[PDB]
Structure formats: structure tokens, C-alpha cells
Coordinates of C-alpha atoms in Angstrom, one line a residue:
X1 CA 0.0 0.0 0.0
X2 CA 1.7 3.3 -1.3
X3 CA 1.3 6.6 0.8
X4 CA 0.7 8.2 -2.2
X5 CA -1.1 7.7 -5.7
X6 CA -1.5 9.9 -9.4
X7 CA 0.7 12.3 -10.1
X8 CA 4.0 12.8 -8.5
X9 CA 3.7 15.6 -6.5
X10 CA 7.4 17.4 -7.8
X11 CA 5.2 17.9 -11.3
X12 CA 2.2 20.2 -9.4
X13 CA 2.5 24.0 -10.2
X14 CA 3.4 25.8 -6.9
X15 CA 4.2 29.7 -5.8
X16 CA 6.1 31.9 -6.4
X17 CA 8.1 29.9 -9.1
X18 CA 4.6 29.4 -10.8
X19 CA 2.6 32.6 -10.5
X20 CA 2.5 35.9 -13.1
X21 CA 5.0 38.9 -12.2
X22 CA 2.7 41.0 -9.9
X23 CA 2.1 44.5 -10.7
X24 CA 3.0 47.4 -8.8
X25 CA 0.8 47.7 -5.7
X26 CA -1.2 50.2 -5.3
X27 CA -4.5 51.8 -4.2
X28 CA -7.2 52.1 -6.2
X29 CA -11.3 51.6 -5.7
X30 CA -11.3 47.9 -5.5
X31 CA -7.9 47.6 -3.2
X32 CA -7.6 49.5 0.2
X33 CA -3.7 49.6 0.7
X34 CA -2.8 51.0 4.1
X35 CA 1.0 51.0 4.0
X36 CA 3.4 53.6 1.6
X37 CA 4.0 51.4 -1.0
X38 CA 6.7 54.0 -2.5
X39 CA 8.9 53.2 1.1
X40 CA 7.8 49.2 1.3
X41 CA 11.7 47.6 1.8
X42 CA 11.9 43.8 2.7
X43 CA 13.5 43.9 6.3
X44 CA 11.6 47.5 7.1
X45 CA 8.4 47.9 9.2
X46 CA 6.2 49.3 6.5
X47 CA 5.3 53.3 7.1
X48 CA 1.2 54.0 7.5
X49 CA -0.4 55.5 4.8
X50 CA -2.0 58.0 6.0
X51 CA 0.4 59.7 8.5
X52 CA -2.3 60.9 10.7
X53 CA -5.1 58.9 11.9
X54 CA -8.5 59.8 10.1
X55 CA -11.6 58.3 11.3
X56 CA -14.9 56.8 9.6
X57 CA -17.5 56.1 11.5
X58 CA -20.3 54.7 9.3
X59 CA -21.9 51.9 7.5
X60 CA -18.8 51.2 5.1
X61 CA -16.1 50.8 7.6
X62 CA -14.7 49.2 10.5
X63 CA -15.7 51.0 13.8
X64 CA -12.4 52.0 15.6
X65 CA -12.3 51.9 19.2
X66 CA -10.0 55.0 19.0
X67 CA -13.0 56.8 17.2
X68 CA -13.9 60.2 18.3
X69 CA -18.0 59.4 18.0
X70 CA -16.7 56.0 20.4
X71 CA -18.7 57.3 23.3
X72 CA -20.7 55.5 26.1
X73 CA -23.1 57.4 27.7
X74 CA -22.6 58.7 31.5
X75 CA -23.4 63.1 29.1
X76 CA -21.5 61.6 26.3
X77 CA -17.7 59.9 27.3
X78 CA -14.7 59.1 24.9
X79 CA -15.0 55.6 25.4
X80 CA -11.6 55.2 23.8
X81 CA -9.9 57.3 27.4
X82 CA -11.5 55.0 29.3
X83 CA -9.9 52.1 27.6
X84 CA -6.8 54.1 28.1
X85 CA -7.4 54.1 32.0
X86 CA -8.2 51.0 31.8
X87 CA -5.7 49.0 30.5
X88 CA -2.6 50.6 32.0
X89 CA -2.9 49.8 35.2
X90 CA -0.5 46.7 36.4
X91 CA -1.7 43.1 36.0
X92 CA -0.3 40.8 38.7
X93 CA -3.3 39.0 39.3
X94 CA -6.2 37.5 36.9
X95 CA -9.1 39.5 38.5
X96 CA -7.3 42.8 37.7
X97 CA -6.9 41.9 33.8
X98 CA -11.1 40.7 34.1
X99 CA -11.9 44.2 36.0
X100 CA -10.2 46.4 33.3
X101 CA -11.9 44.5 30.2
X102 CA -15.4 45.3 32.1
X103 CA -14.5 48.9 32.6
X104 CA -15.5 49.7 29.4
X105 CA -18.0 46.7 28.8
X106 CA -20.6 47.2 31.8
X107 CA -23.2 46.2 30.1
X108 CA -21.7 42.5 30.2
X109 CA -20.3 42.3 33.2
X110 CA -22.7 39.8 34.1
X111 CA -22.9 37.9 30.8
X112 CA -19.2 37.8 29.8
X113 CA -17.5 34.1 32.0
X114 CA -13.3 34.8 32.4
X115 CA -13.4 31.4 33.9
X116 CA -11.0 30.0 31.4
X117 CA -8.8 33.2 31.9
X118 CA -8.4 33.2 35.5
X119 CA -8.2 29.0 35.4
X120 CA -5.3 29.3 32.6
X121 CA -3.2 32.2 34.9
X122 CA -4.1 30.7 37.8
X123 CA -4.3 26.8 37.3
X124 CA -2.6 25.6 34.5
X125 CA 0.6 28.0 34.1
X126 CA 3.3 27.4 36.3
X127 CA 4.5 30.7 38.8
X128 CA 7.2 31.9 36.0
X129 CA 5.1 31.4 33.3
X130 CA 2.2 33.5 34.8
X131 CA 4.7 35.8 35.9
X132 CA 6.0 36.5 32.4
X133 CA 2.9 36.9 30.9
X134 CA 1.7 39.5 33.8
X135 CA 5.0 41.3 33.6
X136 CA 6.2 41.2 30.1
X137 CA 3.5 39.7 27.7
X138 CA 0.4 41.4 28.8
X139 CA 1.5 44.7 28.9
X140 CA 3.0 44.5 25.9
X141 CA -0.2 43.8 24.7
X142 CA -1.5 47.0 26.5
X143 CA 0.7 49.2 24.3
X144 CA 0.3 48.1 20.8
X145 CA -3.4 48.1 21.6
X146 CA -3.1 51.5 22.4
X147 CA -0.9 52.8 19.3
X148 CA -3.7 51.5 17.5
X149 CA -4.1 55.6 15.8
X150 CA -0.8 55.5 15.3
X151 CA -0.2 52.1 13.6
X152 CA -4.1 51.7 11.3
X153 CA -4.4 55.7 10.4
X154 CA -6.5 54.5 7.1
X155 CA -9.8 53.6 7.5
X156 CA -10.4 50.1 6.8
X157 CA -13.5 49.0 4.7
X158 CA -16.0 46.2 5.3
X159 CA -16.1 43.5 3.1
X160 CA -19.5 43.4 2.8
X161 CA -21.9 41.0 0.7
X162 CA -21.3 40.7 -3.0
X163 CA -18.1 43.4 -3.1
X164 CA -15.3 42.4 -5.2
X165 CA -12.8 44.1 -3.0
X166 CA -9.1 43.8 -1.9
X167 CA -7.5 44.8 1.9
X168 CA -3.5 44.8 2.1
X169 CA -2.2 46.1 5.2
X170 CA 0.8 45.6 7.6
X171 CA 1.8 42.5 9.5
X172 CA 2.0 45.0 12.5
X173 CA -1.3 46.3 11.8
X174 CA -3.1 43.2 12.2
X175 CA -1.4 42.9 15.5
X176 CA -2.5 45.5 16.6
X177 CA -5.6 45.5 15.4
X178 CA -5.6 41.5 17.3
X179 CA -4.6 43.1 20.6
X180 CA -7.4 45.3 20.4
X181 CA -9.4 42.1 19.4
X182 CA -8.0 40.4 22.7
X183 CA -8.8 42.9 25.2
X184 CA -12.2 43.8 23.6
X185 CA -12.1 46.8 22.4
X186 CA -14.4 47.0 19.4
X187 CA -17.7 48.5 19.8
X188 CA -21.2 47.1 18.3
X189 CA -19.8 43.9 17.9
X190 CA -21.2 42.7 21.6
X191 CA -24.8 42.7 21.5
X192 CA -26.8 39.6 20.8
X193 CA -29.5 41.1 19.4
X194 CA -27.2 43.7 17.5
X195 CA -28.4 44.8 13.8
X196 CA -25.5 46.1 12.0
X197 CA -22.8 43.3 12.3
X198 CA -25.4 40.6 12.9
X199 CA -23.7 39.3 9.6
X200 CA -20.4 39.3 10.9
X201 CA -18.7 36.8 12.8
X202 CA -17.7 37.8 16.2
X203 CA -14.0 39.8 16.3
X204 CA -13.5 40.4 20.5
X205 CA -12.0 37.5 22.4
X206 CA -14.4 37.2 24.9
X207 CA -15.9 33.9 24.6
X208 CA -12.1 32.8 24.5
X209 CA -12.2 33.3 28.3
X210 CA -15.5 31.5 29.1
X211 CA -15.9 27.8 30.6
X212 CA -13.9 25.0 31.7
X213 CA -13.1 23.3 28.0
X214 CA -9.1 22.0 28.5
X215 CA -8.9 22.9 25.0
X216 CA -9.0 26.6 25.8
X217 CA -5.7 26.7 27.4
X218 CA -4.1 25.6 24.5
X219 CA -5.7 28.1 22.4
X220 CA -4.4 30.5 24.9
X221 CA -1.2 29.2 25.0
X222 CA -1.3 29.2 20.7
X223 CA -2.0 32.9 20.8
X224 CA 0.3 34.4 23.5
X225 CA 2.4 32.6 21.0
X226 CA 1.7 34.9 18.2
X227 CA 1.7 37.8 20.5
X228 CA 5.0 37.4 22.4
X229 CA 6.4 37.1 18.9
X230 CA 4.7 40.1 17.5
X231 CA 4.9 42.7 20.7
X232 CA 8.5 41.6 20.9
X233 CA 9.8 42.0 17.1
X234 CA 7.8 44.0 14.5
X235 CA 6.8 41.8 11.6
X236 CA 7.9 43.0 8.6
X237 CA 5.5 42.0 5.9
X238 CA 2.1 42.8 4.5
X239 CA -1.3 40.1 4.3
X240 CA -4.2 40.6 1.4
X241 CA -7.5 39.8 2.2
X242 CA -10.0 39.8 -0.7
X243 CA -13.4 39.2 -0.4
X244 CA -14.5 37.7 -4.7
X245 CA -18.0 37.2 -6.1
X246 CA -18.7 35.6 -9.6
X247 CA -21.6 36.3 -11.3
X248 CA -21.4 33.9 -13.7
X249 CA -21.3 30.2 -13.1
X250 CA -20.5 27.1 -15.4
X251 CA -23.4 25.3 -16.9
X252 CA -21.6 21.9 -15.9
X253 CA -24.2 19.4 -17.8
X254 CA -22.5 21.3 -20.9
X255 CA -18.8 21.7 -19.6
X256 CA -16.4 19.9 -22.2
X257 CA -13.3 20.4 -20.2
X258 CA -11.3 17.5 -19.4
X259 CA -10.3 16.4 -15.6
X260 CA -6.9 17.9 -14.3
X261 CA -4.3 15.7 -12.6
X262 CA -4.6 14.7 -9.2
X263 CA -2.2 13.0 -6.0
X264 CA -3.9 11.8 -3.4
X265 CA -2.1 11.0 -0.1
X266 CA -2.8 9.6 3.3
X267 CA 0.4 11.3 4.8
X268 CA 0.8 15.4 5.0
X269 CA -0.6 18.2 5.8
X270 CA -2.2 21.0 3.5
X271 CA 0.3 23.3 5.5
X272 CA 3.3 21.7 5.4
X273 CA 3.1 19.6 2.5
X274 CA 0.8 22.3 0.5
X275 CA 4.1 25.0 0.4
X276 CA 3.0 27.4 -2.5
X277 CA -0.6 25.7 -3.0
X278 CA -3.9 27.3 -2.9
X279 CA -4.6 25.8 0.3
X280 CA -8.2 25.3 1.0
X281 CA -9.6 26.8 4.2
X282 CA -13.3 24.2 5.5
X283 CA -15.1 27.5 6.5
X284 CA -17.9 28.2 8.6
X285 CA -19.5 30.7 6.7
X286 CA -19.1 33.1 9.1
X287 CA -15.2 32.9 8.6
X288 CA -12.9 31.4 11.2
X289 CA -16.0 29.6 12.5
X290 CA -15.7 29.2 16.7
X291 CA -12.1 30.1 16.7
X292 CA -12.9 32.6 19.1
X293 CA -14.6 30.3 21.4
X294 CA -15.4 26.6 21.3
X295 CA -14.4 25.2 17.8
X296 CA -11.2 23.6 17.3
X297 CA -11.3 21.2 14.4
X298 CA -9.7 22.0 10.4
X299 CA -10.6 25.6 10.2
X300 CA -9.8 26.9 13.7
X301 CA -6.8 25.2 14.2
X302 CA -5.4 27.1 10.8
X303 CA -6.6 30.6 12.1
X304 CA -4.8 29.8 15.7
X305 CA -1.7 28.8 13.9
X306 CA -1.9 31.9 11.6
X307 CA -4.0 34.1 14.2
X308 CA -3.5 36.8 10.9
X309 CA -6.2 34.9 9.8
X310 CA -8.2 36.1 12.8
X311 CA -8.8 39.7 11.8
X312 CA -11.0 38.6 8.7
X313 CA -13.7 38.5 11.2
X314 CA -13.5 42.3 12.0
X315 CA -14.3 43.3 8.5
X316 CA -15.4 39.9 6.6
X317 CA -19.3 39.5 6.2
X318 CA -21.1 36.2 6.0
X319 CA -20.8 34.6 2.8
X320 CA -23.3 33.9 0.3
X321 CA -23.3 31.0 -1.7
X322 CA -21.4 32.3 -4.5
X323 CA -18.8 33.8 -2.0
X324 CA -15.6 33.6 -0.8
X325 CA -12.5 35.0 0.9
X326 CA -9.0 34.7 -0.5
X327 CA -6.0 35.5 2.3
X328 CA -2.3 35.9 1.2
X329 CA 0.4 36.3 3.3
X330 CA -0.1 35.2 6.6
X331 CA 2.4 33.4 8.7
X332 CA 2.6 30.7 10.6
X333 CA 3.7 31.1 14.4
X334 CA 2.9 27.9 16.0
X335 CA 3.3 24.3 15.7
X336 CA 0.5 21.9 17.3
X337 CA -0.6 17.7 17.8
X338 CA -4.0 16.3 17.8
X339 CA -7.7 17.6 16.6
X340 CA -10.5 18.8 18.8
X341 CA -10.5 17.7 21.7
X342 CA -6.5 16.4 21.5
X343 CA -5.5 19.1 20.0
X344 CA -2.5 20.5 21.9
X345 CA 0.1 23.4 21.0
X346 CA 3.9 22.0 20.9
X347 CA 6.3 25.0 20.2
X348 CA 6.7 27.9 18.6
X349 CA 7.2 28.0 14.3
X350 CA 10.0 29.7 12.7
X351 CA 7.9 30.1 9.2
X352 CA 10.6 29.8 6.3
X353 CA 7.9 30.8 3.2
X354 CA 9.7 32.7 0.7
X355 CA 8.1 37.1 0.5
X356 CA 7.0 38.2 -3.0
X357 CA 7.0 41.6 -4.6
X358 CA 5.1 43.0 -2.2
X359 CA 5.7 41.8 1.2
X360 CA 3.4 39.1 1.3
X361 CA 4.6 35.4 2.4
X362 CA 4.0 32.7 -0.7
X363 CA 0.6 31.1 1.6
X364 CA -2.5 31.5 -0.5
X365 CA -5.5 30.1 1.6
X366 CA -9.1 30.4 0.2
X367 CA -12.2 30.1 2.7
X368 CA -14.9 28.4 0.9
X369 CA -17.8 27.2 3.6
X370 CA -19.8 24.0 2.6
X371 CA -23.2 23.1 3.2
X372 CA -24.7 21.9 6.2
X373 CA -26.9 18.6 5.8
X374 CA -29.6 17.5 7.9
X375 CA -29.9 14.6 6.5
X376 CA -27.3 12.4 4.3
X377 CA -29.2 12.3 1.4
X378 CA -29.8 15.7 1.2
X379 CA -26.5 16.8 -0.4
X380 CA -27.2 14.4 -3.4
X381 CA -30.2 16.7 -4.8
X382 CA -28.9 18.4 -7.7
X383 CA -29.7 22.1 -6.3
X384 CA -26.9 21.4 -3.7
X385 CA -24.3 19.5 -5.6
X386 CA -24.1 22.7 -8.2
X387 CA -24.5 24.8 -4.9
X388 CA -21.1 23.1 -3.6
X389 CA -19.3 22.6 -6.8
X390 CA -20.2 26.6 -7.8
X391 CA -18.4 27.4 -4.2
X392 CA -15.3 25.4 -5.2
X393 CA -15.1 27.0 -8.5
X394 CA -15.4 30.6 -7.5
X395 CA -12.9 29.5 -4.7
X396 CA -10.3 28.1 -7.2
X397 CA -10.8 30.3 -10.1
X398 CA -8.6 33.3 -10.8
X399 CA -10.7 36.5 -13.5
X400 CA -7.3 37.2 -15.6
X401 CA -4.6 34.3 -15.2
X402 CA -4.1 31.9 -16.9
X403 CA -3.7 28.0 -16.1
X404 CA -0.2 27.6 -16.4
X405 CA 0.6 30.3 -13.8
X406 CA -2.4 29.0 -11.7
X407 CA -0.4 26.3 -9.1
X408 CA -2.4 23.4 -7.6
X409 CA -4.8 23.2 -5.4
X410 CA -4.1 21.7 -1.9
X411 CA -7.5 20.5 -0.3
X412 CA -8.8 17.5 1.3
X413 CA -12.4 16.0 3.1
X414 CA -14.3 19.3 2.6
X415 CA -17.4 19.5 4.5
X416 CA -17.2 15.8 5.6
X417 CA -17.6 15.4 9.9
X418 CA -20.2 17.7 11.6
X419 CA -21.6 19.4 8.7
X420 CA -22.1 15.6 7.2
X421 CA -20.7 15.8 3.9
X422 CA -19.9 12.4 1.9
X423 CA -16.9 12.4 1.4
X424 CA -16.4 10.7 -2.3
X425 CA -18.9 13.0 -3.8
X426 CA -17.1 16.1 -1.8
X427 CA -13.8 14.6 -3.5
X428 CA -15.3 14.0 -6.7
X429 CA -17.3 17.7 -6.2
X430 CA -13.7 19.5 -6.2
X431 CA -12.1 17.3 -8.6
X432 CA -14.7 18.8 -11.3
X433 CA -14.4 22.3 -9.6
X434 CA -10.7 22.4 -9.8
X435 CA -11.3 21.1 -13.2
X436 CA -13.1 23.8 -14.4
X437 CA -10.9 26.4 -13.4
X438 CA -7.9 24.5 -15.0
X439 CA -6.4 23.4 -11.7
X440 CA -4.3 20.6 -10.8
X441 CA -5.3 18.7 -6.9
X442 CA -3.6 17.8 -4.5
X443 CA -5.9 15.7 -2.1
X444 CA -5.1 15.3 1.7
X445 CA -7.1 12.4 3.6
X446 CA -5.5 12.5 6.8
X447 CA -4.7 8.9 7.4
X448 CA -8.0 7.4 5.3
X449 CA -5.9 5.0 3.0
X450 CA -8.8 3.4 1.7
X451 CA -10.6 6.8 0.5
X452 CA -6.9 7.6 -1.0
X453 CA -7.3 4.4 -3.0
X454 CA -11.0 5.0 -3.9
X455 CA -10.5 8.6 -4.8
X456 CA -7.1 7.9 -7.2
X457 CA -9.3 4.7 -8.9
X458 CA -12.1 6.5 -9.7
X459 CA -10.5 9.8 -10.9
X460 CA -7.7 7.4 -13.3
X461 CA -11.2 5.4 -14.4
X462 CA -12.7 8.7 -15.3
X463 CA -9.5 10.2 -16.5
X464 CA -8.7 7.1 -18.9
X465 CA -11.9 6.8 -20.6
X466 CA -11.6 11.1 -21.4
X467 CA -15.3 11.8 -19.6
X468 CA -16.0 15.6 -19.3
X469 CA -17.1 17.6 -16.4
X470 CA -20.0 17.9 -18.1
X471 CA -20.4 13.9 -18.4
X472 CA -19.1 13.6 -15.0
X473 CA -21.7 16.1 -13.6
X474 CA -24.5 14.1 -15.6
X475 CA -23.9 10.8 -13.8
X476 CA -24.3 12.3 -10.5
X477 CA -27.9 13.7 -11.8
X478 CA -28.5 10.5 -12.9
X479 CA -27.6 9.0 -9.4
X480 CA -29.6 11.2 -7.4
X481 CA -32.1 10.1 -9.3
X482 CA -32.1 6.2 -9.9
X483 CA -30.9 6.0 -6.0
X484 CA -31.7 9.1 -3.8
X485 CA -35.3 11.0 -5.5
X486 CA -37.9 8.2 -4.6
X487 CA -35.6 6.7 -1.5
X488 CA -37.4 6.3 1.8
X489 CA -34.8 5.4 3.9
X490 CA -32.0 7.3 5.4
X491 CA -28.7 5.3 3.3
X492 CA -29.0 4.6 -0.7
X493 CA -29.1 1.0 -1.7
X494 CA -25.8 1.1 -4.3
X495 CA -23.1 3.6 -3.2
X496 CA -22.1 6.6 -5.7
X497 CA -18.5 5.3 -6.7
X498 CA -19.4 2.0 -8.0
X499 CA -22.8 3.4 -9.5
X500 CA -20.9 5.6 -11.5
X501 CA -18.4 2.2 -12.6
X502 CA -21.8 0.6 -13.8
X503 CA -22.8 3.2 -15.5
X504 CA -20.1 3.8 -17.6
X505 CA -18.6 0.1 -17.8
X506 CA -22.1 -0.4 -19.4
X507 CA -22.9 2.4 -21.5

């Protein structure tokens, strides 16, 4: 039994050595760029853009804490002082840290649980440990917080429902932007029943600090991570986060492209082993999914090992179905073990991934969300097939480049586990995606040997006999409804793999 079957992985396109020679960055109405791109050096913190803070406070754009109009009523208040009061005071005990997050969050004083803050500082750290995040760590935190007006002067834009839009800002932006995040600084984004970012995910850290999961101190222990790296030594580089909608989508009974090559492996990682690949992120659609409180499978593991990843939620909004958010440039910070509930962090991560032109580490990672099924059958009614193979595509295709400077795309079980996706017809599902948008796949199964073999037999059965997307895509209508229209019971009688063997082999 190989580890690996298809295409030798040395043949798959990768970044940078693949990709088109970028242009010159720059600002313009589809791409907010908060850095001076004339002074961006590799090696130099980048310089804000504008010099001065300038504040928005509207509809269109993130809501600073450092806002002027950030008021709580008392006669109006600068809410943004009291944060200022609040935070540098001294830490030497957990309470103190709890007390000055409430200070300018009354109103949940009484809904908002530290338990897993105080239990982590108290409970699980060791006296040094606690002392160095009290002493050192903490209020380091405190002060880039604090220069947020200093370090994001630009306003920053939502990415709001069907905007074809582009944010590149600093490395040290985002952390500062993520210590606000930490301490819970953002307003409107509290309320339950809130109206304006009810379609955002949450950004504050709050339910980080609820409960008595023993996952939660390794998610704390994964993010001071990031942040004594980040408070100690400015990172240097930028991140793009673009939110792309297509209008138009294949009609895939008529598609006449062939299938693209594929390796499939029960060994690897999409991180490690995915180096220059568009790496597929299994999204909640509300990005990031409970990374900021009780999740901790595929998606929120990525986002606590990149925590850049994190600050999609302060700008990203939900995503339709023919959504998705594209991230370049984050860096890795942390290594980890396990999955849910064994997840554990090990150590920190020296991330080697090569810059390009402007700043950005070569990681590409695409958040496409899949469905949800109720019931297993569900996801084999042809509505929600093109509903998931429509996401793939607008998550793998590229308006403008060509396939040859388009590298592979590094995916695995999309959608399978809680949200109950199959996980041959997912495989197959991207295959024709990929397809479709004239990508190569490379296919992660996370030690599933037998779904490597099924997957590789099924795409070389396909491949050999030259079947179209478009003939693909018909055999999975014609599945749905010889085996799942008129079923009554919760399982088909013949499985979709060799259903689509006897339908061919007999044709």
C-alpha cells in the first residue's frame, strides 16, 4: 500500500516559481492599501499611509475603538480614554486583567465568563510562566493596543456581501488590530440582538475566556504565541485579504473540459506539505468559524496557527453562496498535535515561506464554507451538488490568469464530519471544480488509506476513458435520481462510486 497515488507531487505547479509577475501595488477603488507602498523595503516595518489617523464612523467601515464618536453614555464619554485608563494599570493577578476588560463593557459584566482566563493564569501556568505573561507579555499587549491611531491611520473598509474588493495592510497592523481584538475593544460587535454586524462573525475575544473546556488553554497558550512574537519584534511584511464574487457560473451538464491531474495521499498536511498551493480553508460561513470560542477542528486550528487569519472577522461579512475569501500572506507562528478535543500546542514556528514583490509570504488560503446537511441524502439533490461545486469554483478560479501560472490546489475531506458531507462525492465535487478552473489537486485524507485508493481509482477510471465535467456532472444527476429522488430510507441501496463504474462500464 503506497502513501501516495496519481501524479508525482514534484510535477504540481506551486508559488512563487509558478505565479505571473505582480504589478505594482497600489490603491485604487477595488484595493484599500494601508501601507506607503513608495517606502515598502523587505526587512523594514512598512510606514502608514496615511500619516495621521483619520476616522470613519459609518456603515462602510470598521468602527475604531479609537473613534472620536466612540462614546458611552454617563453626558456623552470618549470611550476610547476609558480604555486608556483602563488597561494601563498593572496586571499581577487575573481578576485585575477581568476588572479592566469590564471597565468599558458594563453592560456584560454579568454575561461575559473569564473562567478559562483566571483557570489558565491561575491553574494551568506554572509561577514563572504567569509571571511572564503579567510582567512582560500582557502589557506589551496593553501598548500596541493602544498605538492603534498610530499604527491603522486608514480607514479600513467592510467587506461586505457581493463586493469584489481587496484589503493589504501591515503584518503590524493586524497585530495591533488583534490586541485590540483580545482585550475587547471594538464596539457594536457585543450585542446579541445587535443589527449592523449581525452578519459578521464575532472579532473580541471574549468567549475565548468562558468555561472549563481543557482545549482553551491551548488556544491561549497558541496565541500568546503569536503575540510574544509580534509585541517583541515587528513583523515586517504585508497580508491581502479579498473578499471575490462571480456572477457567472459554469453550466456543468454542458462543460467539455477535461479532468486535471490529481495526487492523493494519506500522509501530510495542506500546511506543510501544501508550500505554494492554494490551500483550502473548510469555512464556517461566518469565517474562522468558533475560533474565538469553542471550535477547534480543520478551520480553527489554521486561524490559531496563523491568528492573521483572525482579523478577517473584523471586516469579513457572512458569505453567500457564491462567496468567498481569498488570504495571502499570513504566517505561521505555532506548531500543534491532535484535533478537537487532543488538539495540543507544541512550540513555537519559525515560518521559512519565501516574501513576493510586495511583502506578502507565498501562503494562499481560500475560505470556501460547505453546506450543512440534515440529512445524508440531502446533499445528493442536484440544487446542492451545483450549490457546492459553484463554491469550489469561485474558490479556485482566478478572473485574468491563466492556467499555467495558476499552481495546484491543496484540499482534502471538505465539509465531511459535523456538517455531514460524503466524502467521495465532496472529493469528486472539487475534482470537477478544480477542473473547471484548469487546476491541478492535490488531495489530503488524513490517514484514510482506503478513501486515497477509492479517490485515485475512480479519478484514473474517469480520466482514462476522457469523460467531461459535463459527463461527469450528468452521472451524479442521474444518481440522485435512480438511488436518492424516490428513497425512503436514510442510506442509498448502491453507493455513488461504483454506481458511476456501472454506468459507464455499461454504456
Amino acid at each position: 500500500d503506497k502513501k501516495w497515488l496519481g501524479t508525482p507531487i514534484e510535477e504540481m505547479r506551486r508559488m512563487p516559481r509558478c505565479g505571473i509577475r505582480l504589478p505594482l501595488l497600489r490603491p485604487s477603488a477595488n484595493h484599500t492599501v494601508t501601507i506607503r507602498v513608495d517606502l515598502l523595503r523587505a526587512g523594514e516595518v512598512p510606514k502608514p499611509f496615511p500619516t495621521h489617523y483619520k476616522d470613519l464612523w459609518d456603515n462602510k467601515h470598521v468602527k475604531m475603538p479609537c473613534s472620536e464618536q466612540n462614546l458611552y453614555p454617563v453626558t456623552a464619554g470618549s470611550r476610547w480614554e476609558l480604555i486608556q485608563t483602563a488597561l494601563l494599570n498593572k496586571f499581577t493577578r487575573p481578576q485585575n486583567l477581568k476588572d479592566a476588560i469590564l471597565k468599558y463593557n458594563v453592560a456584560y459584566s454579568k454575561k461575559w465568563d473569564f473562567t478559562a482566563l483566571i483557570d489558565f493564569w491561575d491553574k494551568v501556568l506554572e509561577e514563572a510562566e504567569a509571571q511572564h505573561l503579567y510582567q512582560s507579555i500582557l502589557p506589551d499587549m496593553v501598548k500596541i493596543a493602544l498605538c492603534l491611531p498610530n499604527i491603522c491611520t486608514q480607514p479600513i473598509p467592510l467587506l461586505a456581501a457581493a463586493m469584489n474588493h481587496s484589503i493589504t495592510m501591515s503584518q503590524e497592523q493586524i497585530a495591533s488590530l488583534l490586541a485590540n481584538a483580545f482585550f475587547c475593544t471594538f464596539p457594536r460587535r457585543n450585542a446579541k440582538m445587535k443589527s449592523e454586524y449581525s452578519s459578521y462573525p464575532d472579532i473580541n475575544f471574549n468567549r475565548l475566556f468562558e468555561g472549563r473546556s481543557s482545549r482553551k488553554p491551548e488556544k491561549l497558550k497558541t496565541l500568546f504565541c503569536y503575540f510574544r512574537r509580534v509585541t517583541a519584534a515587528a513583523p515586517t511584511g504585508l497580508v491581502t485579504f479579498t473578499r471575490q464574487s462571480l456572477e457567472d457560473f459554469p453550466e456543468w451538464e454542458r462543460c467539455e473540459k477535461p479532468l486535471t491531474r490529481l495526487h492523493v495521499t494519506y500522509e501530510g498536511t495542506i500546511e506543510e506539505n501544501g508550500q505554494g498551493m492554494l490551500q483550502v480553508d473548510f469555512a464556517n460561513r461566518f469565517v474562522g468559524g468558533g475560533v474565538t470560542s469553542a471550535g477547534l477542528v480543520q478551520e480553527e486550528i489554521r486561524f490559531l496557527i496563523n491568528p492573521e487569519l483572525i482579523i478577517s472577522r473584523l471586516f469579513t461579512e457572512v458569505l453567500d453562496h457564491n462567496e468567498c475569501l481569498i488570504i495571502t500572506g499570513t504566517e505561521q507562528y505555532s506548531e500543534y498535535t491532535g484535533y478537537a478535543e487532543t488538539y495540543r500546542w507544541s512550540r513555537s514556528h519559525e515560518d521559512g515561506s519565501e516574501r513576493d514583490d510586495w511583502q506578502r509570504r507565498c501562503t494562499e488560503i481560500v475560505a470556501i464554507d460547505a453546506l450543512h446537511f440534515r440529512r445524508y441524502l440531502d446533499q445528493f439533490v442536484p440544487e446542492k451538488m451545483r450549490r457546492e461545486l459553484n463554491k469550489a469554483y469561485c474558490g479556485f478560479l482566478r478572473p485574468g490568469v491563466s492556467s499555467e501560472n495558476l499552481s495546484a490546489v491543496a484540499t482534502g475531506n471538505w465539509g465531511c464530519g459535523a456538517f455531514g458531507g460524503d466524502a467521495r462525492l465532496k472529493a469528486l465535487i472539487q475534482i470537477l471544480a478544480a477542473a473547471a478552473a484548469e487546476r491541478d489537486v492535490v488531495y489530503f485524507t488524513f490517514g484514510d488509506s482506503e478513501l486515497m485508493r477509492d479517490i485515485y481509482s475512480m479519478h484514473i477510471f474517469l480520466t482514462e476513458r476522457k469523460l467531461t465535467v459535463g459527463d461527469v456532472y450528468k452521472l451524479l444527476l442521474r444518481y440522485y435520481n435512480e438511488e436518492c429522488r424516490n428513497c425512503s430510507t436514510p442510506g442509498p441501496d448502491i453507493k455513488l462510486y461504483p454506481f458511476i463504474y456501472h454506468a459507464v462500464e455499461s454504456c
